[PDB]
Design a protein around this nucleic acid. Structure first.
Lengths: 209, 119, 122, 114, 54
RNA sequence: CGAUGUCGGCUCAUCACAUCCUGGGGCUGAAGUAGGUCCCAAGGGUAUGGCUGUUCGCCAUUUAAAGUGGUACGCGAGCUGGGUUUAGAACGUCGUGAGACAGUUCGGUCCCUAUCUGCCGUGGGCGCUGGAGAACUGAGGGGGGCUGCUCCUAGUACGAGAGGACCGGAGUGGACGCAUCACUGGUGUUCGGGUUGUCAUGCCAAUGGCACUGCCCGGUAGCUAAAUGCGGAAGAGAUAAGUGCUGAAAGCAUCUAAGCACGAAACUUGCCCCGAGAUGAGUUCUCCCUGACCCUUUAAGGGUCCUGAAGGAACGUUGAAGACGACGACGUUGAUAGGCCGGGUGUGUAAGCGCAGCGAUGCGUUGAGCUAACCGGUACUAAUGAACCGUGAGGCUUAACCU
RNA sequence: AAUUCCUUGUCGGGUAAGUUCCGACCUGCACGAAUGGCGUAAUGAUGGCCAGGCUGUCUCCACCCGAGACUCAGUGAAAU
RNA sequence: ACACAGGUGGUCAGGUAGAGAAUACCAAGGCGCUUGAGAGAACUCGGGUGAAGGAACUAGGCAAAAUGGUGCCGUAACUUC
RNA sequence: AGGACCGAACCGACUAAUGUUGAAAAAUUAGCGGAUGACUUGUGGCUGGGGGUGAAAGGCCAAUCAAACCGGGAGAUAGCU
C-alpha cells in the first residue's frame, strides 16, 4: 500500500481510560493531491507522485508551475513518490486523505534526523572516554588508536571516526497508531519520530509483518 | 550546539557583555548616533528597545528599574521625559540598521544605529 | 538503580543492618537492579543474635530505592533510602519473618506473595 | 501550534482544586488488582508543583513507618481520582526540596490561615 | 608532522587554485545622487536608497 | 647499530577457524532430562571484582558463552610509565678494593603545528553534446544479523520411581543500536529569589559593581541520559554436513552414474541508509530561446549591432542546517529576523503607600512585580528600485515513418 | 624480616574474594651485637596496609561558562 | 640574545571588616598588558554543576571532592611525664 | 625559655596539570615545607685546576666539570668512516 506525507506538529500525551499515559506524536497530514501517475509503458515501473501544503505563487518557478498546471493541481510545498503494489490504481489530480490509515495497525515513519553538525567519536560511535586523570595528557575524548602496524599499514574503509551527525534520512519501523481524524487532518502514533517540529515526514504502512 | 539558542557571546566575558551593553546603550540615548560594528548593533536592538517601551510609562517603580540598568540618572530623566511621549505610538522598530562598510584597522563590518524619530 | 559495591538498608528482621550488593544476577553485563529483582549481597553489620551473621553471601531483592519506579501513567514512587529484603540463597524464600517499612506494588508475583502479605503498607 | 492546544484541551479534566506548595494534600488514587479496583488514600505535604498544560504534575512528600516516601502525581491522569487540601501551609518558596533533610520537629510546616 | 619530499611549483599551484578572490561584479546606484555604492550599504556622502541619513 | 622504542594496562579494532555459546546433523556403552564424540557452519555475541607492574594464574560471584590464534608476541608522530634497565641510597651475598649480583628495596623530565598514502566528513571546477528546474529507476556499496527466563501444550511422551521432553505457540527481560523530549530528571554564569563583606549612586530607602556565577535555592527553551518508543523478524531461492525416491553399471543392493525432494543464525534476497563521475555519465515530466548584418586563405570558422529568455548567481533578513563552504525559509504580491501585544512558564506576594509594634519586623494592595531561547499574532524596524551570469532552435552518419 | 631463592613457605586476622599488610612458627639459600643488636614516646612534603567522611576517579558521562582551534583583515616562521 | 609570564637590596604604608604586612572591597596614585572583528564544530586547556551508586578506576584515593574561625564541654592506648 | 607550635614577607622545591620549534636554554598555575635560627640577605674580600670547596651528590668552581676556560706543542695520532 502507498504511503502519505505529513508534517510534525510536535509531541504530547494521551490518557487512556485504563490509566496508560501513552506518549503520542501528532502528525499533520494534509490531503495529498496526486500530481503524477506513472506506469510501465513509458517509465518501466509503477509509482504515483503527490504534493501537499501551500507555496507562494511568486516563488514557484515556471517549470514547477508548468508541471502543476498540467496536472490540474494547485501548487504544494514539495513532491514525493510512492510505488504502488499489485491491484492499486490512482488517477492524476485526485486527492488522498488521512482516512486511508483508518484500518492499518503498524506504520513506518521516515524523516531527516536532527542535524547536530561535527560531533566527536564519543557521540558518533559511543566511544568510551579514556582516563580523565592518572597521568593522562591531552588525550581524553580522542579516538585513540585507529589501526594496526606496518601490516596492513593503512586504515580500512568504513573505520569509525568523527564526522557529521544528523541531516540524513532515517526510517523508524513498526509504530502503532492511536487515532485517525480527517476532521482535524491529524494522525496519532505511539513513540517518537525523527526530525524537529514542523519537519517533513513520510508515513507508510509497515512492511514488517 | 546552538539549537534554538539566542544571544551572542561576542568572544567576551558574560559580565563584560552585560557591562558593555549597559554602557553603550546609554550612548544611544545620549547622542542618537553610533557608528559601531554590525553584530553589536543588532543586539543593541535587543536591549535598548525593551527599555524605551519600559520608559513609555512613568512611575517611581519604573524609574528605579530603569536606573538598575544603565546606572545613570541623567540617562533616566532623558529616557522618560523625551522619548516617553515621543514613542508612545510606536509598536516596535525603535531603531534601524544602516550598514557603512568596514573599518581600516581590522576590516570589521560596521553599521550605524539610528532611532527613527531623529530628523 | 542498584549496582556493585552498593550499601543497602534492610527491611526485615533477618538480622542484617547494613549490606553490600556485590552482583546483579539475571544478565550478562547487567548494570543496575530495579525493584523486586534478584541481587547477591554480603552482610556488613548485624545485630548480635540474629538469624545471620557478618560476612555471609546470600541473595536478596530490592524493595525500596531513591531513583524510584515509573508508573504506567507517568508517576514515580521514590523513597529517601534504598532498602532490601533477605532471601535464602537456594530456596529464594525470605529469611526474616516481618517487614519494616512500606514496599511498592510491582513485587506482586508468585515468588513474592509472602512479602506483600507481610508488608505493613502498600 | 494551536492544533496541539486544542488536542490536549479535550482530555483536560475540568475540575482540579487550587493548591500551592506547603499544603497538606490528601490524594485518592485508583489501584487495580485482580478484577477489582479500589480507592487508595495518600496523605502528605506537597513540595513541588509543575504546571504545564496536560502534562501538569505535583509531588507530595509522605512520612511513613519512620522514613520518607515521595510521589509525583500526573494531575490530569485518570488514575488519580480526588485531590483535597487538608491544611493550608505557609512557605516562602515554590519548591520545598529542603524537606528531604528535615525530620521530626524540624519538618514542621506553619499553617497559612489566609 | 614533517614533510618527506619537496613539493613542486605545480602542486602549490593546484592548492592555490581555490585561493583567488571574487569581485563585487555589481554595485548599486542611489536614486538621488546617482553615485555607485555597495548594495544594502550607505553611500560615501551619507545616502541610502535616496534619503540623506547622516 | 649516520636509531625499526621494551613488557604490561587504557582507547580503538581487523582477520583466520583448529567453534566458547547460539544454529544443523551422524554415532552413542543415546529411556527421558543431561551428556560424550565427530562433522557442517565465522553471521552475531563472547564477564565484574580481590591479590600482584604483570601476561598468566588462584580465589569470590555472574553468564547461553566468558573461544584459540595472526595482525612489528596489532596499536607510545594515540594515552600511561607500574616492571625491566641510567645517574642517588640501603639489605643479603661475592670481591682486599674500586665495584658487582633479570636478587631485594625507596625515589626517579615519554617531544612533534601532518607534506604524501590511508580513513572520516564536507565543498569548488568540469563533464554527461541546446540551456534549466524537479521527481525517480537502479548497477554498485554500507548498516543490521546476539540471546536468556517464565507460561500453554503437559506435568503429557519416556520412565519401576526420582524425574521429565521434542515439535509448536504465547509473554517478558539482559546487552547493542537508532530516534526523541510527551514523562522523571541533569545542565541551564542570558530568569526570579535569599544572603555576607565592601564600594558607589548626596543621604534614608531602593539599587548597581566586585569578591570562582561571591556564596547559595529553584528554574524557560535548547541539548541530554538515568527517561520513552522501535529494531534485530516472518517469508523466498540455491545450498553445507546430513536425510532420502526411482534405478542400473554389477540379474541383488546402492542418495547417483540419468532424473527427482528435503536440508542451518552461513550464501543470494527480504529490512534500513547512501547511490547516474554507473565517463556504460540513465529514465520521466515541465520550462525557455524561432533577429539581422558582414569577413575569410569556406571551417563543428571568425566578427558587428540588437537581443539577455527560463533558470542561476550575488546582497539582505536568517534557521531545531552549519567549522568555512554547502543545505533550507523569506525579501513590502512580507511573518525571514528583531521589537511590541496577549498568553504560558519560572521565581515568589515587587516598589511605593497605610496600620501594628520602642525595634528588628509582620500584615493589606498582592499570587503582586519581573521574566531568556516557548505559543498565538502583530509591518514598527531591517530585508530597495535595479544591475550580473546565462542566448538567438542546438552537429555528422544511418534507419523507420509522415509525403 | 629494606635480608627468604624454593615462595603466593605454613597457620590465624582483616576481605565475598588479599602474591601487598598485620600477628605467630623457624627448614636463618645468605640476621646478629659500634662498617652496632633489639625496643623506643615524639617527629617525617618518608615506605606499606586498613577504615569513616567525601566526591565525574569510575559504571558513563551530560550540560554550561571562558581561552584557542574554525572564518575575515594585517604581519608572518620551522624541523625536513 | 627580544619592548621576554623570570631574577634584583633598602625606605613610606590610609578607610571598612579583619588578630594580622593574610584576605575581600576601596582612598591617593597607576594601568586595561602593541593585533583585532566574527562564528558559537570536533578536539585541547582553565573552571561550574549533577540523577543513582560511592574508589567498583588505577601500580597507587594521582587528581578532584571534603574539613577550616572563636569561646565552652570533653578527650584513649602509649610515654623519655 | 625553646635548633617550640599555627601562619604572611622571606628562604625553598614535595605532588599534579600546562608548557615542552615554551612566556621561560627548568617556568607558570592550584596545593606544599621552614619561617628567632645549624635562619636569611645587601657590600667587599679570601681559597684555583690533579687544585679549591663540599651537613658528601663526584656535587659546585661564570647556562661548561670522573679534572674549568683561553692560547700554544698542533696540521698530536687515527690499522677507522
Amino acid at each position: 500500500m502507498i504511503g502519505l506525507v505529513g508534517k510534525k506538529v510536535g509531541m504530547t500525551r494521551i490518557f487512556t481510560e485504563d490509566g496508560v499515559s501513552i506518549p503520542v506524536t501528532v502528525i499533520e497530514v494534509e490531503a495529498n493531491r496526486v500530481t503524477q501517475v506513472k506506469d510501465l509503458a513509458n517509465d518501466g515501473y509503477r509509482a504515483i507522485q503527490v504534493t501537499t501544503g501551500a507555496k507562494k505563487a511568486n516563488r514557484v518557478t515556471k517549470p514547477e508551475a508548468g508541471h502543476f498546471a498540467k496536472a490540474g493541481v494547485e501548487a504544494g510545498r514539495g513532491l514525493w513518490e510512492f510505488r504502488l503494489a499489485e491491484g492499486e490504481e490512482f488517477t492524476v489530480g485526485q486527492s488522498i486523505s488521512v482516512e486511508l490509515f483508518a484500518d492499518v495497525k503498524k506504520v513506518d515513519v521516515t524523516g531527516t534526523s536532527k542535524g547536530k553538525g561535527f560531533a566527536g567519536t564519543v557521540k558518533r560511535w559511543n566511544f568510551r572516554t579514556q582516563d580523565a586523570t592518572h597521568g593522562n595528557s591531552l588525550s581524553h575524548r580522542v579516538p585513540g588508536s585507529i589501526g594496526q602496524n606496518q601490516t596492513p599499514g593503512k586504515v580500512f574503509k568504513g573505520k569509525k571516526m568523527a564526522g557529521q551527525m544528523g541531516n540524513e534520512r532515517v526510517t523508524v519501523q513498526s509504530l502503532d497508531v492511536v487515532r485517525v481524524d480527517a476532521e482535524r487532518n491529524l494522525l496519532l502514533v505511539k513513540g517518537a519520530v525523527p526530525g524537529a517540529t514542523g519537519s517533513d515526514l513520510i508515513v507508510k504502512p509497515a512492511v514488517k509483518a | 550546539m546552538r539549537h534554538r539558542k539566542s544571544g551572542r557571546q561576542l568572544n567576551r566575558n558574560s559580565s563584560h557583555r552585560q557591562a558593555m551593553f549597559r554602557n553603550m546603550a546609554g550612548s544611544l540615548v545620549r547622542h542618537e548616533i553610533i557608528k559601531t560594528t554590525l553584530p553589536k548593533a543588532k543586539e543593541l536592538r535587543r536591549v535598548v528597545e525593551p527599555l524605551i517601551t519600559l520608559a513609555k510609562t512613568d512611575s517611581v517603580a519604573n524609574r528605579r528599574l530603569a536606573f538598575a540598568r544603565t546606572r545613570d540618572n541623567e540617562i533616566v530623566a532623558k529616557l522618560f521625559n523625551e522619548l516617553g511621549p515621543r514613542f508612545a505610538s510606536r509598536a516596535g522598530g525603535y531603531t534601524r540598521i544602516l550598514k557603512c562598510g568596514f573599518r581600516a584597522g581590522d576590516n570589521a563590518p560596521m553599521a550605524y544605529i539610528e532611532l527613527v524619530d531623529r530628523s | 538503580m542498584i549496582q556493585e559495591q552498593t550499601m543497602l538498608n534492610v527491611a526485615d528482621n533477618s538480622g542484617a543492618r547494613r549490606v553490600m550488593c556485590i552482583k546483579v544476577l539475571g544478565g550478562s553485563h547487567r548494570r543496575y537492579a530495579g525493584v523486586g529483582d534478584i541481587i547477591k549481597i554480603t552482610i556488613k553489620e548485624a545485630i548480635p543474635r540474629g538469624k545471620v551473621k557478618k560476612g555471609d553471601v546470600l541473595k536478596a531483592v530490592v524493595v525500596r530505592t531513591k531513583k524510584g519506579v515509573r508508573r504506567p501513567d507517568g508517576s514515580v514512587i521514590r523513597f529517601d533510602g534504598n532498602a532490601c529484603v533477605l532471601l535464602n540463597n537456594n530456596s529464594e524464600q525470605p529469611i526474616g519473618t516481618r517487614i519494616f517499612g512500606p514496599v511498592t506494588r510491582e513485587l506482586r508475583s508468585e515468588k513474592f506473595m509472602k512479602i506483600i502479605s507481610l508488608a505493613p503498607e502498600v | 501550534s494551536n492544533i496541539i492546544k486544542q488536542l490536549e484541551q479535550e482530555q483536560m479534566k475540568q475540575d482540579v482544586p487550587s493548591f500551592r506548595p506547603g499544603d497538606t494534600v490528601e490524594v485518592k488514587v485508583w489501584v487495580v488488582e485482580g478484577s477489582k479496583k479500589r480507592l487508595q488514600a495518600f496523605e502528605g505535604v506537597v513540595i513541588a508543583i509543575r504546571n504545564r498544560g496536560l502534562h501538569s504534575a505535583f509531588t507530595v512528600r509522605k512520612i511513613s513507618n519512620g522514613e520518607g516516601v515521595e510521589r509525583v502525581f500526573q494531575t490530569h491522569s485518570p488514575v488519580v481520582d480526588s485531590i483535597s487540601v487538608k491544611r493550608r501551609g505557609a512557605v516562602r518558596k515554590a519548591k520545598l526540596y529542603y524537606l528531604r533533610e528535615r525530620t521530626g520537629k524540624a519538618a514542621r510546616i506553619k499553617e497559612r490561615l489566609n | 608532522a614533517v614533510q618527506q619530499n619537496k613539493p613542486t611549483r605545480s602542486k602549490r599551484g593546484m592548492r592555490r587554485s581555490h585561493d583567488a578572490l571574487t569581485a563585487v561584479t555589481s554595485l548599486s546606484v542611489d536614486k538621488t545622487s546617482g553615485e555607485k555604492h555597495l548594495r544594502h550599504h550607505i553611500t560615501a556622502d551619507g545616502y541610502y536608497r535616496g534619503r540623506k541619513v547622516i
